[PDB]
Every structure is written in C-alpha cells, then in structure tokens.
Design a protein around this ligand. Structure first.
Ligand SMILES: [Mg+2]
Ligand SMILES: [Mg+2]
Ligand SMILES: [Mg+2]
Ligand SMILES: [Mg+2]
Ligand SMILES: [Mg+2]
Ligand SMILES: [Mg+2]
Ligand SMILES: [Mg+2]
Lengths: 214, 211, 208
C-alpha cells in the first residue's frame, strides 16, 4: 500500500515536492475550519454560514457556493426573495434594489421589485385662488421610485411630518384628513352666512351654487 | 534535517506527490496576494479588504472571516449596524432591509429596523362637500413599510412633488402648508364679506358665519 | 521530470502532500477549480459576480470576487459608484449608497448623499382656530432620502388612506383634489358676494 514520505523540506522550485506545512497554510487561507488531520492527513472542508431570506441560515462547503448564495438569497440584513432578473443601477451614483428594479439617472434610487425611476424635476409652487404658495425642496438631486406606472406602492407607517414653509417632511393621511375637515367646517359657516343674509320677502339662499336670490 | 525533494513532475493519481507548481496555482485561486515565496517556500496568507459601518475598512486573512464580515458589518454602500435578528423577505419578490424587518407579502418592501409590512390596499378617492375627487395610483402592487404601529418613521428631505390629477409623487409639509394657508385666507375673505354685508343693512359673527 | 507514485497522505508538517489532499483544497475553492487527472494541470476557480448594468463577469480568484462585492455590489443590491462608503453610525441603523450617513439609533439613510438627523414628532395642525390631531406622533427614527439642498422626490407612490388614524403617505393627486375643493367653495362664495351686491371685490371679499 501507499506510504507517507517523511522529512521533506518546503519546496521552492516549481518541480519540488510540497510538504504539509505548506498545504496547511493554504487551507488556513480558506478558513471556515478547513484543516489537515494530524492522524490521517484527511482534509476537512471549510464550512461557511450564509443567510437565507426566511430567518434561517445554511452552511456551504466551498467558496463558490457561498458567493452564489450571496448573489441569490442575499446577506444578513439585506435580502431579496427572488429568482427574477437583477436590478440595474445605471445612473452615476445611483442605487437599485430588488428584482427588475432600474435606477436610470444620476443619484436615483429604485426601491422594490419592478421599481423604475424617471429624471426628477422640481415643483416650485401651487396657485390657489390666484394666490401662489412657494414650496421647499425645489431642486431635487434625483428621485426615489417605489414602483412604476400601474404598479405603484403605498408607503406605510409614516410618522406625521412637520407642516410649514420650509418643511421637506413627507405628510401622512391623518394630516390631509384634518385639512379636509377644516374645508367642510368653513363651508358650514358659509352656508350660515348665505342663509342669514337671505333673511327678505321670498328671498332664498342656494348652497349648491352659493347664490342668494332676492 | 528535512531535505527538499527535487524534479517531481505534476501528480495525476490521488496517491501521486504534488509539486510547488501545482500548489501555487491553487494558492493563486485565493487571490488577495496569497503566494509561495520562490526562495524559501514560505506561504503568504491572503489579505482581503472588508468594509466596516463606521467609515473604515479592515483586512482579514481568510475567506471565512470575509464572509462573516459581509454577513455582520455588511458590504460597501450597504451597511446595517446591528447584532439583532436578520430581516426576512417572506413575500414572493419581496425585499427586507434591517434588523427585525419583515416583508410579508408579494412585492413588499420592509425598510428599517423593526419595519413590518401588512397587505397593501388601494384608495380610490375622497369626498369633500358632496363632490368626489378621484386619485392616481389606486391599484398598489404592494407596500413599502418604514416602520410598524407605534414605531413609525418620519421621511425626511423629500423634494416637493407634482400636484395634479395624475400625480403619484409624494408631497411634503410645505405643500400642505400652502393649502392650509389658502383655507385661512379664504376665511379672511369670507369674514370681510360678512362684515361689509352687515354694514349695508346689524352685525356679523365670525364664530358661526351669521349676519 | 518524474512523478512520485504510491504516496500516502502526509500528516506531520514535514511530510509530503499527495494529489488527494491538494484536490480537497481545490474542491474547497469551488467554481470548477480542479486538478486534471491526465496532466496534473490546475484549473482556476470561476466565480460569477453581478455588475450594476445588467451584466455579469467571471473572476478567477476569491479576492477579485470580494472586491466586486465591495464595489459593484451583489444581485438585487447595486450602487453604481466610486465615491466613499455609506456609514451606519446609529445603533440598529441602515445606510445605503455613497456618502450616505445614518446618524441616530434606528435611522435609515437611503441614497447617494442622504443624511439623517434625529427625528421629532408632529402632533397636530390648527386651522381657523380648530386643532386637528395626527397619527404616528412619536417616531422612533427617520428615513432620509436626501439632505438640505439635495432633496429627492419620491415617485410612483400609490394613494394613501385618508383618515384620522392613517399613517400612509399622500401623493399629489390627493392634495390636488383638496385644492380643487377649495376653489369650488370659493366659486360659491363669489356667487354669494355678487348676488348680494345685486360692487363685489373677489380679491378681498368686500361688498360696497
Ligand atoms: Mg437568517
Ligand atoms: Mg481585498
Ligand atoms: Mg462605513
Ligand atoms: Mg468604510
Ligand atoms: Mg414624515
Ligand atoms: Mg409620473
Ligand atoms: Mg456579485
């Protein structure tokens, strides 16, 4: 049967033999517990822990498998559950996250499956009853898209934002609701004004049009 | 004591000796500067650069350590600073980011520590003074959650969005502020109406609108 | 020039190594790394990494793969940049994209140059002397999508629930309907003013 060769110095020339001290240094480079057994000379495979998308982990026995898992199931704290095509971060300094996500322009962020960006443009103001109200944050560096036309996403668990001239905070539904209520509250007062003014001689007020008939 | 064995051809059978040439090719496979010293035979470890979450990097000397860093401190441009449990992307094609984040449904996104999604639902319109105003983006494919009930997040540094019937842009507080101002300005105008109307007749009540 | 046969696996550090032992190391590399059973030639590993432009590349060593991961990214998570790293400085914070900084516990910074500051709550608004209370008034952190002077729009946002307890984001079509309702009411008030005047000043509301 085969016999071990003893008393072999480290090889230097390319046609020199290699000893266990040399191979062991390379197995140490793999890490993950890879090692040479001192009794049998058997080589233990490395064991690398990778993180699945369902709250579990797996161990794999070679580097390629670990890289392939990183490029499919993700890394700890950053998971996409998909087999669909890769995201594309095409714009300079853009970020694209999730299957089929596409960040097209500089500084853009695409967040979510099938989220796609278009070039951001600023909105300076709104005009209501001929009065123009100016906005904060009117020269966007780019956009964060959370979807695409017909496949938009809601954004949920958003804390109420500041309301004021300089606010660049997002606004939630409880905030628009208060505003809506105030409009109807004002309307009730207007209908009062209309009716009390009507009171006369057959005179009337029509809330449908606001017109007093007298 | 030990002597080097020379003039060894590449091994082919499992019980053949290997030479330095063969070991060096495997060593090249590690990369990161791993090598065999052509004079002493000493093996240089690989050195891999990994990215911490604090603006610094570290170097590690084996592949396992690099994978563990990737799965703890993260990768360049994608960092979570945590030791709490992993995120979970449970929905098909979902994305979950940060400790304890959970994306529960198809196409959902969970963004942030403890961010949890619930199934998305559409909102078609609002009714004000008996008139119905229809919305854009009424059929959501999923939701982006940035928190959970009682542990919500503000969203900050949001540029003003388009305001129009087809707009699916988010709005910021300066935009709602303008609208709120228009309501009070309209109210000043109405108060003037009530008062000037009273004068032609008498008193006007701003509390109820009555003349 | 000549091969040594019938070598058993080495155990002590000064023992010779055989192909079976070296083969286990190539096997640990994966990616097709191998020793040719005919010639003894070593095949490099081949690892697929994912670029930021919808392409992939193959690299021939583990260092090159780690460097790709730390530059062009991983499948489904790409930043296209050569700028400095993001920094997640707060406990349990997340920072994504070049120069992004999450400064506080539980913060998220999302995008190139996105920076957070400590979140604060907003409780209510007061309109015509009436105070309206809000939902989600005690935030545990913020998601910043930019910084002062370099804000980001947020786009393709589905319409949010409108109601007292709603913590959904609102889109522009929703504020638009509300603005329309204001001008509709104003039309009615202008009719009120004109008909009562039968001058009516629509700019001030005054009837003379
Ligand atoms: Mg896990
Ligand atoms: Mg490196
Ligand atoms: Mg960092
Ligand atoms: Mg760094
Ligand atoms: Mg907010
Ligand atoms: Mg659009
Ligand atoms: Mg990759």
């Amino acid at each position: 049967g085969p016999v071990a060769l003893h008393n072999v110095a480290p090889g230097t020339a390319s046609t020199d033999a290699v000893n266990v001290g040399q191979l062991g240094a390379v197995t140490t480079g793999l890490g993950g517990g890879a090692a040479i057994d001192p009794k049998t000379g058997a080589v233990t495979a490395p064991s690398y822990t990778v993180y699945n998308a369902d709250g579990t982990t797996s161990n794999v026995g070679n580097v390629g498998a670990a890289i392939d898992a990183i490029n499919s199931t993700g890394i700890k704290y950053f998971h996409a559950n998909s087999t669909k095509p890769d995201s594309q971060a095409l714009g300079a300094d853009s970020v694209a996250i999730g299957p089929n996500a596409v960040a097209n322009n500089a500084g853009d962020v695409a967040l979510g499956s099938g989220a796609v960006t278009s070039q951001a443009g600023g909105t300076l103001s709104e005009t209501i009853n001929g009065v123009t109200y100016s906005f904060a944050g009117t020269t966007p560096i780019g956009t964060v898209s959370v979807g695409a036309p017909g496949v938009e996403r809601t954004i949920t668990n958003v804390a109420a934002g500041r309301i004021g001239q300089s606010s660049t905070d997002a606004i939630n539904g409880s905030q628009l609701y208060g505003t809506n209520q105030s409009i109807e509250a004002l309307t009730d007062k207007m209908n009062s004004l209309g009716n009390t003014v009507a009171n006369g001689s057959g005179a009337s007020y029509n809330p449908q049009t606001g017109a007093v008939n007298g």
